């Protein structure tokens, strides 16, 4: 029998979220010079 | 134009006639009915007559109330050491306080002591049943002027010659014979 635990309404945010971790990394294929121009 | 001093109003008054002069004690019988009942009845019973002050610690306390004068004696009106009574409004911030000596909790005897100064370490330990009135204060302090011999005992200890109860807050006190 699952029961949801009662939360104390005057309880502050329990734990700290601020921590920051670098953005995660397949490329679709692209399918898309003269000397003088260079 | 305000200088505040907070303390609950007292009730009852008792006169102690000592070799050091008169001492007026205003009692709190609302806060400490047990020890003030004990004190009033023991005064009415002549139990404190010719009882010395056997312990003087310079600038700390002067102790008396033992009929035997040894300091380990004395008994209450209740046939046993009675309970301690404490209040946040009664503290030791000063000399001029009249409190109950004990060897521990609920140990209260007939022995009592006057505060020669501040004791913050006796808080929530000894019960405060009274205070000495300013006019008579110096006389209390003369109780503390002695040449002190071994084990905090004066060579010529001051005595309580008699007792007068000036105002008795209790209706029902019957002195024992």
């Amino acid at each position: 029998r699952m029961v949801e635990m009662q939360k104390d309404p005057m309880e502050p945010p329990r734990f700290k979220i601020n921590k920051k971790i670098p953005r995660g990394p397949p490329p679709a294929p692209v399918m898309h010079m003269t000397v003088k121009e260079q | 134009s305000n200088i505040y001093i907070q303390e609950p109003p007292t009730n009852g008054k008792v006169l102690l006639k000592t070799t050091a002069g008169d001492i007026d004690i205003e009692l709190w019988s609302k806060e400490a009915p047990k020890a003030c009942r004990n004190f009033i009845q023991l005064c009415l019973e002549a139990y404190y007559d010719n009882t010395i002050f056997h312990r003087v610690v310079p600038g700390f306390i002067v102790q008396g109330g033992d009929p035997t004068g040894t300091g380990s004696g004395g008994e209450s009106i209740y046939g046993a050491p009675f309970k301690d009574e404490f209040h946040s409004r009664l503290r030791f911030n000063r000399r001029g306080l009249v409190a109950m000596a004990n060897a521990g909790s609920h140990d209260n005897g007939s022995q009592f002591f006057f505060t020669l100064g501040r004791a913050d370490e006796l808080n929530n330990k000894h019960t405060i049943f009274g205070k000495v009135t300013g006019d008579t204060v110096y006389n209390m302090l003369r109780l503390s002027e002695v040449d002190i011999d071994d084990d905090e005992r004066p060579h010529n200890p001051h005595k309580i010659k008699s007792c007068e109860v000036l105002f008795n807050p209790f209706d029902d006190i019957i002195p024992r014979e």
Binding site: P12, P13, R14, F15, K16, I17, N18 | -
Partner: protein, 56 residues
């Protein structure tokens, strides 16, 4: 005070008749309450959750 101290009664200290003043602070409190809930809420949340890192 003007109306109260009308006749024999002088400029002296003793006039009780608060009801009015009392009202005023209650109106104040009615409004300020939600403000303080929101501000103190944030204060607590910063205290416990942490000042947000990103300044996003």
């Amino acid at each position: 005070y003007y109306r109260f101290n009308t006749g024999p009664v002088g400029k002296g200290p003793g006039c009780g008749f608060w009801a009015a003043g009392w009202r005023v602070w209650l109106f104040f409190m009615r409004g300020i309450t939600p403000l303080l809930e929101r501000w103190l809420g944030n204060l607590l949340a910063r205290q416990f959750e942490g000042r947000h890192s990103k300044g996003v």
